[PDB]
């Protein structure tokens, strides 16, 4: 796996030893090359994972996440080099260093063989994102957003550290393969209930679970574009990956310890989709979309069925790509009008037709239009939940209705009606923004032809 880690580390000396007018070109080109190299990890086996060494491995669930993480950095570099034009060379190189460190931490997180190294890197990902949000954010609320984002995660995950250390003392190891082969049930005790809670909330905070999501509308809105993209696309999926990994130790306590979380998520998807219907901020609407979509992944993980696991993996990938595209689309308008209000700049289809097409495609993908991979994941989870309980279909259908409602509401408000008379500084769409939109959207449609690559190990 070092053939991907070492180039990502070498990205840093190349960035720092580059000329002031050549940093973006080198960073983008070599990030794209690293993504091409990482594409080789999709060649998974049918029975067991790819055990590269004692430290790293790769399975059918880690490979799509790794490919998405490697593919995302070029897009963040593309989207960042517009509003960082007036920066100094040192500050630009520091921003790129933070992004590269984030990629390296995520890459080593998704392939860590043990749970302690996984925890170490899973929390090492906090400092670069926190620095990005609190340093290159635009408004004065970025400090509060950073505090919320840091403390929710740490308060949720310190008990996870305690529980993991206890598990290693009682079992002898925290290697995932040994744990999976030597699995043993939990007795229905209070101590086991609290050890279940400690091993679960660390990932529920980062999904986020409904009621524990307050940090997300702050962090995703106050962060710069690259920070928002990495928060929505990859950092939300760490909780899902960790849960699908760690429920191996948990059974059978999950059969009844998952009731409050299932209720919270299936009602919170409705609540967040309804919140999306009255939002004066576009970025906040896109942020709440993420909670509404990740509640379904929480359900799929909690019900413990192969179809739910496959749907959860597909939905995580599709949500990452779609949310990144939507955030980029909103940033394109923000860089024009310098405001986040939705009704400020309206009727933008008349002025920017190709961005209108991109908006339409992103909105169609968000509302899970067949045969999108969004639809594949959501329908698989819906079928699994119907098998779990037939009455879940009411909530699933209502959520599907409200999702399309607010998606087309966001499309029509921003792109239709008559253009505001006074915004006379709307320049034509740049080649960079169109290329960003295309590189976001083409993989989504291409993944429909080979959906087994993003369906996980249960396929």
């Amino acid at each position: 796996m070092l053939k991907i880690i070492i180039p990502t580390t070498m990205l840093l000396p190349m960035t720092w030893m580059s000329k002031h007018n050549m940093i973006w070109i080198n960073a983008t080109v070599h990030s794209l090359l690293i993504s091409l190299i990482s594409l080789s990890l999709l060649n998974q086996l049918g029975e067991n994972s790819l055990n590269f060494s004692l430290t790293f491995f790769s399975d059918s669930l880690s490979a799509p996440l790794l490919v998405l993480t490697t593919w995302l950095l070029p897009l963040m570099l593309m989207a960042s080099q517009s509003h960082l034009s007036k920066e100094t060379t040192t500050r630009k190189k520091l921003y790129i260093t933070m992004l590269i460190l984030l990629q390296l931490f995520l890459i080593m997180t998704f392939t860590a063989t043990e749970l302690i190294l996984f925890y170490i890197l899973f929390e090492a990902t906090l400092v670069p994102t926190l620095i990005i949000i609190t340093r290159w954010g635009n408004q004065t609320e970025r400090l509060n957003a950073g505090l919320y984002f840091l403390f929710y995660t740490l308060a949720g995950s310190l008990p996870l550290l305690v529980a993991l250390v206890y598990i290693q003392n009682t079992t002898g190891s925290l290697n995932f393969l040994i744990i999976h082969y030597w699995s043993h049930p939990l007795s229905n005790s209070w101590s086991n209930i609290f050890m279940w809670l400690a091993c679960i909330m660390a990932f529920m905070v980062k999904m986020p679970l409904y009621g524990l999501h307050l940090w997300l509308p702050k962090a995703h809105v106050e962060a710069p574009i690259a920070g928002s993209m990495v928060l929505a696309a990859v950092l939300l999926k760490l909780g899902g990956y960790g849960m699908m990994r760690i429920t191996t130790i948990l059974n059978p306590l999950t059969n009844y310890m998952a009731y409050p979380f299932l209720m919270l998520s299936m009602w919170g998807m409705i609540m967040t989709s309804s919140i999306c219907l009255r939002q004066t901020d576009l970025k906040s609407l896109i942020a709440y979309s993420s909670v509404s979509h990740m509640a379904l992944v929480i359900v799929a993980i909690m019900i413990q069925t192969p179809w739910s696991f496959m749907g959860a993996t597909a939905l995580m990938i599709a949500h990452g790509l779609t949310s990144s595209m939507l955030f980029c689309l909103a940033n394109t308008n923000y860089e024009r009008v310098h405001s986040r209000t939705m009704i400020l700049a309206r009727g933008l289809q008349t002025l920017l037709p190709l961005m209108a097409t991109w908006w339409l495609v992103a909105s169609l993908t968000n509302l899970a239009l067949p045969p999108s991979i969004n639809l594949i994941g959501e329908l698989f989870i819906i079928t699994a939940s119907f098998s779990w309980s037939n009455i879940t279909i009411i909530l699933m259908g209502m959520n599907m209705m409200i999702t399309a409602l607010y998606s087309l509401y966001m499309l029509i408000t921003t792109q239709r009606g008559k253009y505001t008379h006074h915004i006379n500084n709307i320049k034509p769409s740049f080649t960079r923004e169109n290329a960003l939109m295309a590189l976001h959207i083409l993989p989504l449609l291409l993944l429909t032809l080979n959906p087994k690559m993003i369906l996980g190990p249960l396929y």
Partner: protein, 606 residues
């Protein structure tokens, strides 16, 4: 191989070539609409051959040519069903689409984005073929959603108009409501039957339970605009007249009826679902026909006529006569599309005027439009030997000769009378009398495109019923023995409708004025259903979404409990700890207290 499979796949794959050429140097030329129309005509000509093969030997196939993914036991493949319904419906849809595109070349002549309009129409046709020819539930869902999204994109064609966007979103909502039931049916058929394919579903379900069929009924009611979910179809008249003629008149709105027809082997074994479908169809065909008889916008009248015909189709399905419903779909397509083309010709010739109250004597001004619309109304009203006689009169006869809900029977008969009632109104207020339009006469129907496009479906509306009904094999036991008074029920009620509507219309010439009654207000305002259901539930939902979900729960109490409480507690504890004035006299006494406590508490019991 025999030509059946190759031709059936080719007639679908050659409809996508103009979509691929949408980025070439034909899309930036005024030749593109002609190119698309020629492609559609060639596709119709090619598809005419598998129909002939089925007409000869009843040859039918399923074609699973591509394997998509395998999830454990289940196999999802690109499978096409080329049975009687598909091979009979594709040529009719292609013929109607060819006529509508030739009409669009004239009606959308001054549109700056006509090429885009043609691309959109083609996309809708492709999605409809995908829906119709689908063999598995996932492919049929793909078509189901594609036709809905194309409806959304074509209703809001003039995206500067607020009401077009409102109507498009309304259609999307009313179709998602039935999409809920579609997803219910898919989930039930997958967990219970372990397959999404039609062959497996039929085999494993010899006595089908309620849930999947009720989900299918909900989806069909959403798509076909039944009484619960009806109002979106009349609102869908915001888009251009060709869109209303092609999508919301003859091809899209029959998708729910088609879905219910495809699952008739499972609906044969359920009687409660059949009763529900019968009642829903009867109430829809009554209510929309009652709403149509007081409408002044011609497009709204024809939309309500379409909704009433869809209700009649659902009635036909609900009496265990699905082949009659498919036949009625095929017959109704012709003359209803022709009626919309005539109405659009009238609208274009009167400078975008849609109200019949400003339409006067057009019987002599537009002779061909009047002839076409008279023939269409006669076909629509089940005039004997017209294309509508071979379907609608047989439907009425079957409903009379069945173990049927009596209220549904009476409602169907009253709707049959109201059809002639509203049809008379369009003719009376549109073609008879003295002119009521502005004096600058711009009337002109001497365009070969309009004439030929209308004439093709005119010949169709005249001869298609006889041509088709005598050529399909018999899949129905007939009603050979009937009393004479019941054999002529439909004709009698249509004649009574004609006479009563004509009398009440002729009453308008009298120099007498009177204020409207409450029945007229109920009928004209669509039963107040949009006046209530478009204001009360929407207001309550949008107010709870902000007052409760956004403000009270998310911004106040979820903030209060976890972060604000801990912040307050830490602030209070920090203040409590940090305010000592630095006087040794106090904390040395505290040291003494601590020392004393330690000895007794922790020392005297080790």
């Amino acid at each position: 191989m025999n030509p059946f499979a190759s031709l059936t796949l080719t007639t679908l794959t050659i409809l996508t070539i103009p979509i691929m050429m949408s980025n070439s140097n034909i899309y930036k030329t005024n030749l593109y609409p002609n190119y698309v129309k020629t492609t559609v005509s060639y596709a119709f000509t090619l598809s005419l051959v598998p129909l002939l093969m089925f007409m000869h030997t009843g040859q039918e196939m399923i074609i699973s040519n591509w394997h998509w993914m395998t999830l454990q036991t289940v196999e999802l493949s690109l499978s096409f069903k080329m049975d009687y319904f598909s091979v009979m419906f594709i040529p009719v849809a292609l013929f109607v689409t060819w006529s509508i595109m030739e009409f669009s070349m004239w009606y959308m002549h001054s549109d700056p984005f006509i090429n885009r309009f043609f691309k959109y129409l083609l996309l809708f046709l492709i999605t409809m073929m995908i829906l119709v020819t689908a063999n598995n539930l996932f492919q049929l869902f793909i078509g189901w959603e594609g036709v809905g999204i194309m409806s959304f994109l074509l209703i809001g064609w003039w995206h500067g108009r607020t009401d077009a966007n409102t109507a498009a979103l309304q259609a999307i909502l009313y179709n998602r409501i039935g999409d809920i039931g579609f997803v219910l049916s898919m989930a039930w058929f997958l967990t219970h039957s372990n397959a999404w394919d039609l062959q497996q579903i039929f085999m494993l379900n010899n006595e089908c339970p309620n849930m999947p069929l009720i989900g299918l009924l909900l989806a069909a009611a959403g798509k076909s605009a039944q009484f619960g979910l009806h109002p979106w179809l009349p609102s869908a008249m915001e888009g251009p007249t060709p869109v209303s003629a092609l999508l919301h008149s003859s091809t899209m709105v029959v998708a729910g009826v088609f879905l219910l027809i495809r699952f008739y082997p499972l609906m044969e074994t359920n009687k409660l679902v059949q009763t529900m479908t019968l009642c829903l169809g009867a109430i829809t065909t009554l209510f929309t026909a009652l709403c149509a008889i007081t409408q002044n916008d011609i497009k709204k009248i024809v939309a309500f006529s379409t909704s009433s015909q869809l209700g009649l189709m659902m009635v036909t399905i609900g009496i265990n006569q699905p082949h009659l419903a498919f036949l009625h779909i095929c017959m109704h397509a012709f003359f209803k599309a022709m009626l919309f083309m005539c109405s659009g010709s009238i609208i274009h010739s009167l400078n975008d005027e849609q109200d019949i109250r400003k339409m006067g004597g057009l019987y002599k001004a537009m002779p061909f439009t009047t002839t076409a619309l008279i023939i269409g109304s006669l076909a629509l009203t089940g005039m004997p030997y017209l294309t509508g006689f071979y379907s609608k009169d047989l439907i009425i006869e079957a409903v009379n000769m069945s173990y049927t809900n009596a209220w549904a029977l009476l409602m169907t008969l009253i709707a049959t009378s109201l059809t002639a009632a509203y049809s008379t109104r369009i003719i009376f207020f549109a073609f008879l009398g003295k002119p009521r339009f502005p004096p600058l006469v711009l009337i002109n129907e001497n365009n070969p495109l309009l004439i030929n496009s209308i004439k093709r479906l005119l010949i169709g509306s005249i001869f298609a019923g006889f041509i088709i009904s005598n050529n399909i094999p018999p899949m129905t036991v007939p009603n050979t023995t009937m009393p004479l008074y019941m054999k002529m029920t439909a004709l009698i009620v249509t004649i009574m409708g004609f006479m009563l509507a004509l009398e009440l219309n002729n009453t308008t010439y009298y120099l007498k004025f009177k204020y409207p009654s409450q029945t007229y207000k109920f009928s004209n305002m669509l039963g107040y259903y949009p006046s209530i259901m478009h204001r009360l539930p929407t207001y309550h939902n949008l107010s709870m979404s902000q007052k409760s979900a956004s403000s009270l729960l998310d911004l106040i109490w979820l903030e209060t409990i976890l972060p604000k409480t801990t912040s307050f507690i830490q602030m209070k504890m920090s203040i409590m700890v940090s305010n000592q004035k630095g006087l040794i006299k106090l904390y040395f006494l505290s040291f003494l207290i601590t020392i004393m406590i330690s000895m007794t508490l922790f020392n005297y019991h080790e």
